[PDB]
């Protein structure tokens, strides 16, 4: 039940910037993006230690309430007890999550939604700032 | 039907910073703060030209769907076609609103709420930045 933002109307090309602080006892946190809570074109879930994963980013989609296939990244540029910033955009092919220091993750656009109208944060991540570009 | 943010969990003393761009032909816009759409401890409505009023800030509350006693500020530090930032805090007595950028007025806390969990923007005001401190 973390921060939820609706009616974002984030169209392709536009950038969603999110800055927040990661808890010191961080297990994992979640950034959800899509149309609503049941239609997520991006489930961004860095896991420090959660569900057996250690220092692993887990991405997925949810379509009509149904989870898609999990995609995993070896690179884990997140440290517990620190401030994490992500820049998010998308096109017809992929969603792109960029980190300031150069890290960039791609996740296939599986929902093909016209825009991102929904953002929800959860887990050990307290959002401090959100910008729309 | 503008931006809506829920589960803010804004405790007393904490600052809610909101930046957005006011349309050149703006008639009015709204910042709603409270628990939900039916319970607003602050209805912040600058009216450039609306409901017969002009260059007047209209503040009110909504408690259980019912509008409280409307109140107005003689001062109007908003320009159509320009970027406006509003900083908002509250104690158990008043809400404090900081307008661009020397301006500060108190609005009585009439809902007594523990925290601000709900923000909704509307009217001729496209949100570009929201910060929580
Ligand atoms: O079929 C059961 C599966 O369940 C998921 S976890 C589940 O998956 C989703 C992603 O698809 C969401 O992350 C979801 N979620 C998290 C939150 C949340 C809520 C609040 C805060 C916060 F932070 C987070 N809400 N929803 C998770 O519960 C397991 O990973 C998966 N599995 C696959 C592997 C696996 C392990 C090692 C290597 C490998 F390749 C795969 N290790 N487990 C398998 O056991
Ligand atoms: O009952 C009649 C009253 O009606 C309100 S209008 C009403 O006020 C509410 C707050 O008090 C809400 O703002 C409400 N609202 C706005 C929006 C919205 C929704 C979407 C976008 C967007 F931008 C905005 N939604 N809801 C308004 O409709 C007038 O203030 C009021 N009155 C007028 C005067 C008055 C008149 C002339 C001169 C003068 F000095 C005072 N002095 N009192 C009086 O005539």
Numbering used by the authors:
A (entry chain B), B (entry chain A): 2 to 134
Describing publication, verbatim:
Concave surface of S-sheet contains conserved amino residues and forms a primary binding groove to which specific glycans up to a length of tetrasaccharide are bound. In this model, the best structurally characterised subsites C and D are responsible for recognition of the β-galactoside-containing disaccharides, whereas the other subsites (A, B and E) remain poorly understood regarding how they contribute to ligand binding interactions.
Galectin-1 has one arginine (Arg73hGal1) at subsite E and none at subsite B, whereas galectins-3 and -7 contain an arginine at both subsites. This relatively small increase contrasts with the ~300-fold binding enhancement measured for galectin-1 binding to TD139 compared with binding to TDG; galectin-1 has only an arginine (Arg73hGal1) at subsite E. Protein-ligand interface analyses (PDBePISA) performed on all the complex structures indicate that galectin-1 provides the most buried surface area for TD139 binding (383 Å2) than galectin-3 (372 Å2) and galectin-7 (285 Å2). In galectin-1, Ser29 and Val31 correspond to Arg144hGal3 and Ala146hGal3. Even though the 4-fluorophenyl moiety appears to fit in a similar manner into the pocket formed by Ser29hGal1 and Val31hGal1, the substituent is displaced from Val31hGal1 by ~16°, resulting in the formation of only two fluorine-protein interactions in comparison with four observed in the galectin-3 complex. The manner in which the 4-fluorophenyl-triazole moiety of TD139 is situated in subsite E is a consequence of the salt-bridge networks of galectins, i.e., Asp54hGal1-Arg73hGal1-Glu71hGal1, Glu165hGal3-Arg186hGal3-Glu184hGal3, and Glu58hGal7-Arg74hGal7-Glu72hGal7. Taken together, the comparison among these galectin/TD139 complexes indicates that the common arginine-arene interactions at subsite E are substantial, despite the small differences in their respective interaction geometries.
